Design a protein around this motif. Sequence first.
Motif, PDB file in Angstrom:
ATOM      1  N   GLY A 188     -15.465   4.469  17.231  1.00 14.98           N
ATOM      2  CA  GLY A 188     -14.157   4.530  16.600  1.00 14.98           C
ATOM      3  C   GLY A 188     -14.177   5.128  15.198  1.00 14.98           C
ATOM      4  O   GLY A 188     -13.176   5.041  14.483  1.00 14.98           O
ATOM      5  N   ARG A 189     -15.358   5.635  14.801  1.00 12.25           N
ATOM      6  CA  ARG A 189     -15.508   6.335  13.534  1.00 12.25           C
ATOM      7  C   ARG A 189     -14.670   7.622  13.534  1.00 12.25           C
ATOM      8  O   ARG A 189     -14.156   8.024  12.488  1.00 12.25           O
ATOM      9  N   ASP A 190     -14.529   8.244  14.725  1.00 11.02           N
ATOM     10  CA  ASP A 190     -13.955   9.562  14.938  1.00 11.02           C
ATOM     11  C   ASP A 190     -12.435   9.504  14.944  1.00 11.02           C
ATOM     12  O   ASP A 190     -11.803   8.450  14.880  1.00 11.02           O
ATOM     13  N   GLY A 191     -11.843  10.702  14.982  1.00  7.44           N
ATOM     14  CA  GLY A 191     -10.401  10.873  14.940  1.00  7.44           C
ATOM     15  C   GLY A 191      -9.853  10.935  13.509  1.00  7.44           C
ATOM     16  O   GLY A 191     -10.603  10.865  12.531  1.00  7.44           O
ATOM     17  N   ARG A 192      -8.522  11.158  13.386  1.00  7.96           N
ATOM     18  CA  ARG A 192      -7.788  11.442  12.139  1.00  7.96           C
ATOM     19  C   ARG A 192      -6.668  10.421  11.875  1.00  7.96           C
ATOM     20  O   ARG A 192      -5.894  10.128  12.784  1.00  7.96           O
ATOM     21  N   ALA A 193      -6.670   9.864  10.654  1.00  2.23           N
ATOM     22  CA  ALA A 193      -5.891   8.688  10.284  1.00  2.23           C
ATOM     23  C   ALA A 193      -4.404   9.018  10.163  1.00  2.23           C
ATOM     24  O   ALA A 193      -4.034  10.053   9.610  1.00  2.23           O
ATOM     25  N   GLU A 252     -33.455  -5.984  21.687  1.00  3.95           N
ATOM     26  CA  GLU A 252     -34.119  -4.961  20.900  1.00  3.95           C
ATOM     27  C   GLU A 252     -35.491  -5.453  20.411  1.00  3.95           C
ATOM     28  O   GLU A 252     -36.364  -4.640  20.090  1.00  3.95           O
ATOM     29  N   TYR A 254       0.816  -1.223   0.000  1.00  3.46           N
ATOM     30  CA  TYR A 254       0.000   0.000   0.000  1.00  3.46           C
ATOM     31  C   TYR A 254       0.857   1.284   0.000  1.00  3.46           C
ATOM     32  O   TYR A 254       0.573   2.208  -0.764  1.00  3.46           O
ATOM     33  N   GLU A 289       3.345   4.607   0.290  1.00  3.39           N
ATOM     34  CA  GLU A 289       4.288   5.467  -0.425  1.00  3.39           C
ATOM     35  C   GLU A 289       5.719   5.295   0.084  1.00  3.39           C
ATOM     36  O   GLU A 289       6.670   5.362  -0.690  1.00  3.39           O
ATOM     37  N   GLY A 291      -7.147   7.094  -1.289  1.00  2.31           N
ATOM     38  CA  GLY A 291      -7.057   6.623  -2.669  1.00  2.31           C
ATOM     39  C   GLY A 291      -7.669   5.222  -2.786  1.00  2.31           C
ATOM     40  O   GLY A 291      -8.145   4.695  -1.782  1.00  2.31           O
ATOM     41  N   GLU A 302      -6.643   1.547  12.124  1.00  2.00           N
ATOM     42  CA  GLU A 302      -6.090   2.850  11.737  1.00  2.00           C
ATOM     43  C   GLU A 302      -6.862   3.444  10.556  1.00  2.00           C
ATOM     44  O   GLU A 302      -7.243   4.610  10.574  1.00  2.00           O
ATOM     45  N   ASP A 358      -4.244   9.621  -4.439  1.00  2.00           N
ATOM     46  CA  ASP A 358      -3.842   8.446  -5.207  1.00  2.00           C
ATOM     47  C   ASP A 358      -3.242   8.822  -6.569  1.00  2.00           C
ATOM     48  O   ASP A 358      -2.409   8.088  -7.113  1.00  2.00           O
ATOM     49  N   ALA A 361      -0.919   7.011   3.756  1.00  2.00           N
ATOM     50  CA  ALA A 361      -0.771   7.705   2.472  1.00  2.00           C
ATOM     51  C   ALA A 361      -0.205   6.814   1.354  1.00  2.00           C
ATOM     52  O   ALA A 361       0.929   6.342   1.469  1.00  2.00           O
ATOM     53  N   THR A 362      -0.998   6.611   0.282  1.00  2.00           N
ATOM     54  CA  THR A 362      -0.764   5.600  -0.747  1.00  2.00           C
ATOM     55  C   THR A 362       0.262   6.088  -1.766  1.00  2.00           C
ATOM     56  O   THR A 362       0.351   7.285  -1.993  1.00  2.00           O
ATOM     57  N   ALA A 367       1.072   7.439   7.716  1.00  2.00           N
ATOM     58  CA  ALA A 367       1.688   6.268   7.115  1.00  2.00           C
ATOM     59  C   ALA A 367       0.779   5.587   6.088  1.00  2.00           C
ATOM     60  O   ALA A 367       1.299   4.901   5.200  1.00  2.00           O
ATOM     61  N   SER A 406     -36.795  -3.321  16.585  1.00  2.00           N
ATOM     62  CA  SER A 406     -35.339  -3.328  16.506  1.00  2.00           C
ATOM     63  C   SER A 406     -34.858  -2.739  15.184  1.00  2.00           C
ATOM     64  O   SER A 406     -33.902  -1.959  15.165  1.00  2.00           O
ATOM     65  N   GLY A 441     -11.848   8.150  10.402  1.00  2.00           N
ATOM     66  CA  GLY A 441     -12.034   9.193   9.395  1.00  2.00           C
ATOM     67  C   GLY A 441     -10.911  10.243   9.388  1.00  2.00           C
ATOM     68  O   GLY A 441      -9.780   9.968   9.784  1.00  2.00           O
ATOM     69  N   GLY A 442     -11.214  11.447   8.888  1.00  2.00           N
ATOM     70  CA  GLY A 442     -10.295  12.591   8.941  1.00  2.00           C
ATOM     71  C   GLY A 442      -9.107  12.485   7.980  1.00  2.00           C
ATOM     72  O   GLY A 442      -8.030  13.024   8.219  1.00  2.00           O
TER      73      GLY A 442
END
Lengths: 368, 368, 390, 375, 363
Positions: free
Chosen positions: B16-21, A273, A77, A79, A243, A234, B93, B26-27, B24, B286, A238-239
């Motif tokens: 765990g959707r939140d935060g910034r990736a 539920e 993957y 770079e 690619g 990782e 990409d 980067a493709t 590393a 549900s 998001g954020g």
Amino acid sequence: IFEEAASFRSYQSKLGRDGRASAATATLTTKIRIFVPATNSPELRWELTLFALDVIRSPSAAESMKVGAAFTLISMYSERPGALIRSLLNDPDIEAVIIDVGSMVNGIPVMERRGDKAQEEMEGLMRILKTARDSSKGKTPFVDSRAYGLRITDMSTLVSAVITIEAQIWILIAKAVTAPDTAEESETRRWAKYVQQKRVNPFFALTQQWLTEMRNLLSQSLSVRKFMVEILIEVKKGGSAKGRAVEIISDIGNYVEETGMAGFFATIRFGLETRYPALALNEFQSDLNTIKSLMLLYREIGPRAPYMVLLEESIQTKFAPGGYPLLWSFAMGVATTIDRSMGALNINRGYLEPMYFRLGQKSARHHA
Amino acid sequence: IFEEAASFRSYQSKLGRDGRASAATATLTTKIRIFVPATNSPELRWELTLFALDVIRSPSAAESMKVGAAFTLISMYSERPGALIRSLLNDPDIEAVIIDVGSMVNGIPVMERRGDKAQEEMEGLMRILKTARDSSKGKTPFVDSRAYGLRITDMSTLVSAVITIEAQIWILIAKAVTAPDTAEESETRRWAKYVQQKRVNPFFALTQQWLTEMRNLLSQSLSVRKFMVEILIEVKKGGSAKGRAVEIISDIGNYVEETGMAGFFATIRFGLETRYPALALNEFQSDLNTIKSLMLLYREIGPRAPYMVLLEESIQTKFAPGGYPLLWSFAMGVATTIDRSMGALNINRGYLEPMYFRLGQKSARHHA
Amino acid sequence: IFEEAASFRSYQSKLGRDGRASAATATLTTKIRIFVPATNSPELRWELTLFALDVIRSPSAAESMKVGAAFTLISMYSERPGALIRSLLNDPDIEAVIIDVGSMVNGIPVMERRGDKAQEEMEGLMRILKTARDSSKGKTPFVDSRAYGLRITDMSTLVSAVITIEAQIWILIAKAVTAPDTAEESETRRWAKYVQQKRVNPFFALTQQWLTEMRNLLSQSLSVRKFMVEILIEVKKGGSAKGRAVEIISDIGNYVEETGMAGFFATIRFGLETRYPALALNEFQSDLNTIKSLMLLYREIGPRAPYMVLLEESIQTKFAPGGYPLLWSFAMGVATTIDRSMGALNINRGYLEPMYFRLGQKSARHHAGGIDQNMANRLGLSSDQVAELA
Amino acid sequence: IFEEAASFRSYQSKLGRDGRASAATATLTTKIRIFVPATNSPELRWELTLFALDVIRSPSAAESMKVGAAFTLISMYSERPGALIRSLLNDPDIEAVIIDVGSMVNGIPVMERRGDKAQEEMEGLMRILKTARDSSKGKTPFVDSRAYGLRITDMSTLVSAVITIEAQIWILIAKAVTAPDTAEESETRRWAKYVQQKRVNPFFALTQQWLTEMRNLLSQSLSVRKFMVEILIEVKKGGSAKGRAVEIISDIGNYVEETGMAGFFATIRFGLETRYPALALNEFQSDLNTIKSLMLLYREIGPRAPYMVLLEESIQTKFAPGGYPLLWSFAMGVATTIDRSMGALNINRGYLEPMYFRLGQKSARHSSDQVAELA
Amino acid sequence: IFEEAASFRSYQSKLGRDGRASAATATLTTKIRIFVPATNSPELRWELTLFALDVIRSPSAAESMKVGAAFTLISMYSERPGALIRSLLNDPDIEAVIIDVGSMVNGIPVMERRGDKAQEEMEGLMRILKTARDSSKGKTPFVDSRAYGLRITDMSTLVSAVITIEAQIWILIAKAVTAPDTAEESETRRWAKYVQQKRVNPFFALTQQWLTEMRNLLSQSLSVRKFMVEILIEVKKGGSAKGRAVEIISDIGNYVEETGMAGFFATIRFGLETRYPALALNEFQSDLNTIKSLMLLYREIGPRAPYMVLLEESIQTKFAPGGYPLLWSFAMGVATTIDRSMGALNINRGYLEPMYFRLGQKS
């Protein structure tokens, strides 16, 4: 009064969870060699991928070489492939040597850029490659033979191919460590999707033989799965721009999340539920108190939660659906009756509660 | 109490959707060549238009050249075509080298910027143009051949033609990545509209053969779709007057929005908004809680949402309608029974539960 | 009243410093090729250093190649040489294309990354290397020829050597962009130190001919100096341990700071800090108001401050000593008289006013070395005897 | 007014001291092999000390091996030699591989860790040891030869010996990086003290040839000096009793403090603290402002202060005398005149101002006051 | 202004004194065997003292055993031998194994019930005792032979004897670490006091040969001196009256305090406290600033202060006399001239400045 008991059950569940472990608990660290693509030149990158595919395909290579191969294969993957591995890889049992390849100009194996302490390094590699070819009866990584010979020179073809191979590794993860037999139906179903949707270039398709060899590697190695789940967490965040590469990972993610926490989810979705009239029955109370403690517990386990099963994590034992048997037996009885797709999951555990199994069915199916 | 469970389902969906990736991830970037309009002079625009049409028509160009050609073709809008590309084009990409050649002195291909070393390039271009003509059996971009023949000298003719070709690319986007066969009915219906409404100048009309070749280029390339979706977001915003050019884009937009998030809206429109008394039945609860979590999730994903499917945006997999099976099988059973226009969409998927679908039919059709 | 005037002088000095500059001012970028170390193994690292030494030594190489070579030469420090360049390099005139060369088995040049579209790349390199040898009449980079030949096989030898070559680049910076003639005396004085202290490894000593060729390259290329000054600022920041590599940079820094802002510092050290009885002299009052505005301005310019001159940074012009003429002519007149080592600086400049300079001289010298006004009291009762001795 | 200038000088001095340096500045890390004491047995420990003395004595061994040997030699203190290195060692240029000594009863060198891929390593070691013996014309590490032969059988003898060798390391640091020739006078003077005080056991005296070879290793290797100074700081910190071993280190420390900052301290002690009426002379004002900025700077540099010069610490340049010429020359002219012990300092530096120093001299040697007249 | 400099000198002197050292610095622990009186009878205590005197007199015992012997000998003070050692012993380099003897009839060394390999050990002890007797030409612990045979039975005679031998150990500490030769004059002077005061029972007088062998053991062992000074500090502290045993220690203490800090005390007493016209001299001003920093430093070092020298405490080096030379040379010139008792102290250091010393005398 009774409230004290419920609070005490919760106390027990949280007790001694906290604090920091003494360093003496550290397990004996294993030295693992990762050969990693040196530059952005397509000549080196194609050949190194072929090398790595063959390392994994070899019958005579040791586990130590094989894991390092798998790490090369699923770092393609990046770079800056070495930086990606070194910076995300965060698991104590394994201590990495990352070796950046010298354009792989040597021949069949990776070629030591600065020259080997022992000149046999190159040969042990030669033996590994030969044995790989010979033992596999000449079968190259790809299903369709032109691909095995390809020797790529251009970025476009490279990324088409790399994305394709990578996706075929990540298809596996989803089942390799929950039920590595029974696997093929699901993993083919997911493969068909990515190809049909034109996310990956089918000219480069990887052979059942290579995929089974990799599936087995995943089943049998924790250390590999640790790196995989690190990356899987990782790229789930998001954020960031993605690619084609990160997009394929993220797509696979949607199958991979929650996997091997089956029971916890199934009691939540079906039964809890579902809120069937039967939920009011006196007998359930203990089970309900269980689930409450579980939900709060799940929260506390935090960032690793969508992949507990794949990580083999200790906490997961408590989550094991076997833990809340009355509610679970009823939750299966409802689920199997109400959802035609469900029930294809093999639920032959001795933990099934007959009253709830008969009663769950009898609630969901013959009660309106 | 029970409220905790519902909140927990929501928690899982957002967890765990939140935060910034981590960077590393980067493709490896692919370098792609884009030829750009050096000038506001008609000669270059018509010649660059013909060049660009032929790049896309070519059997002889590589995919890397063809994407860059598609980018030339659908940046013809701009007063400063290079600025338009550079400022909107924003996915990691694919990394653009945009060279605006102004002379167009050389001939059919763009002029080699430096001299002697450009000689190979100019003959590469010649091969590309020859192969384009030859492979297409002499069919030029336009359907009625005098048009391919006309060397435009007037701004008015230029804009008439450019708007016409651009509209013909944007008609493709709508189905290229949702159903690239079966497309014809819809794409003809949209053609008829723009012509009948006198928005686009039929003297310039682009040939089914060329349109299919370009539609396939769009289906199979992410990098082109990224530029298209960048433009599609940018012109969807208000706070600006639009001239003929931006207006055609915006008009196309009204077909393009929501496209290939079919399933999500269908549960909302049909079944949910329809509010059949049957919604009160135990089993559904549900599922309803699920859909609620989904809707609020959709909202939170925000700016990209009108084109998620076309962007391959991973978040979207979660949102996919196969996720809420009972409610969906019932949202369709209603839909297909009550709306004569519905049901023309192929909904033959494995998550259907016939009993729930019939309950939907039985609610909508024989209960009022 | 009078306060308004002083505040107005300050307002003029700070006016238009503010805002963020309109994009049209962005200057036409030069594309330069930078070969960087693709790997950490000496075999490559020694050969690449020899290549780079020769790029800079070449009579036939283009300036575009030479800049890029200099960037290779002064990035040999790094664990990841390409990352060091890409991440610190932040100057608008120049855009680097960086290909990390591995093999370098071609000979003198690198090995063409993806293979060459023309094999003439490699033949361009060959021409570069040949022309380098031939034009230098066979005199190699190092002062003792064995060193030039010596193939390097181990990390230990590599770091010993790289530290040595790098230090020889950084010795240049200090004078390349203030006084690129007259240079030898100073640069040798600094070399003696590093070798005598055993910080830099004399086996790798580089030839006067090579050093002059590199000194000239530094003088004539702005883009190079920009990268040098960027690194020099970046690693001067504290809160880090330093290894031999960073330590040699930082050591050079102690010569490099303030350099080519001579006038600004000299007025501060000599005359101003000296607090001679002549400060009150009305003639200089505005001068003093000037310098105050200068000092506060210098503060405001911030990060680039210790190297403004080397950076060609505009605001520097205002700070240049011609700007405060009366005070300066007197700060020199004092300095030359009082400080034995100073005054070896050529100050035959248009701003020096004989009468005011003579006032500096006499006022200091006849003052018996700033005895005109002493600021020190409370030490105790004044020694008339001591005053007479002075 | 004038106050602005003084504040500005201080601003310049502290400008750019702040912030955290970008990781790209990290210099290429050198892999160094440290053989270290495997177990708590005096049999292994004596033999491994002899091995290590000989590694440093060896003419054919690489600098990479020699540094690692020196680290073995000066980690003999610890109950767990590997832990001592790993826990104190914090210097970026060097990345340590700790080969925990496997008994190594195999001969002169280490024993092959798991069976060597190439047994040439044990034979490399043999070559190293042979060359060491041969090149040194048979002189073994200890000065009186019985000691060189003597296999050690009890902890008592072990500690007596180890204390002795370690003290011989630590006597070097005092001059290794501040005056790497002319060292003999000082190092002998310090030896006499530890022996006369009966703190270290003279049966284990080490040969001038071995001591010069180790002194030179210290001079020529930065990585070694970094580790030495790291340990010297670490053991200087209180909150613990020290017995004989750590006490010898700490004791040496009291000579080693401020070393190679001679000139800076000398201006403080002599001239400044001396406050001769002559200090009020107007010319000095700028110099005094200088010294003030230096003292506040010194404070800011903080924990490494006692060893700045030995640590090659960058800031040291600024601290160097010559940064305050007038005050320094006056400081010397007084110092040399007033203190019988001073003046043995080498003052041949350009920053010295003859005229002003003659003023320092002239100041120094020039309510009764009768007593002062008599003396 | 100038005040900042003086404050800065003080800052430097105290800088980095703070903090707690990382545990890995702990030096390799030495195992030392202490044989200790098992039970509360004068019978055992007399015999064991004879044993211990001879262990130390033996030419054949190794240093590790000799230190442990000396620790047995100077733990005879305690009501509960084992507890006394374990509770006072606080020096990290040495890890003690305590052996409590079952009324050892073995001979010079202990009886051993550990088994068959310990039969060799008892014969090693026999060799040690024989070699002790033989090498010393028959001289037993005491100066007068009846004492060597004594075998006392009762508490009063026991304590009389034990306090006598122990006082003979404690007279040594005064010079053991500060002038190990030339010691006799001082140790006899202290002996005269304790006998004239009737504190110590002269029938049990201990022989010059035994006293020199113990003096030498003190000089050459740090580990022993650590235990001695630990006890010396512990009994110095209040919260209790001291009877005969601890009282003799405490008495000796009045000679033992400040020992080997001669220079520091002398500058304070002579010169400083004395406020000579010389206080006026400007040239010696810095010296004053030095002494100030020293006094505040001394305070900060705290509890061990009166015995720094005996403890080999490193911070002691800083405290050294020629650290503040100008003032010291003048303080000596005053002290030697004014006080008849002074000047018999050897002040021949390279730190002495003849001009300043003459100024001190001239003053």
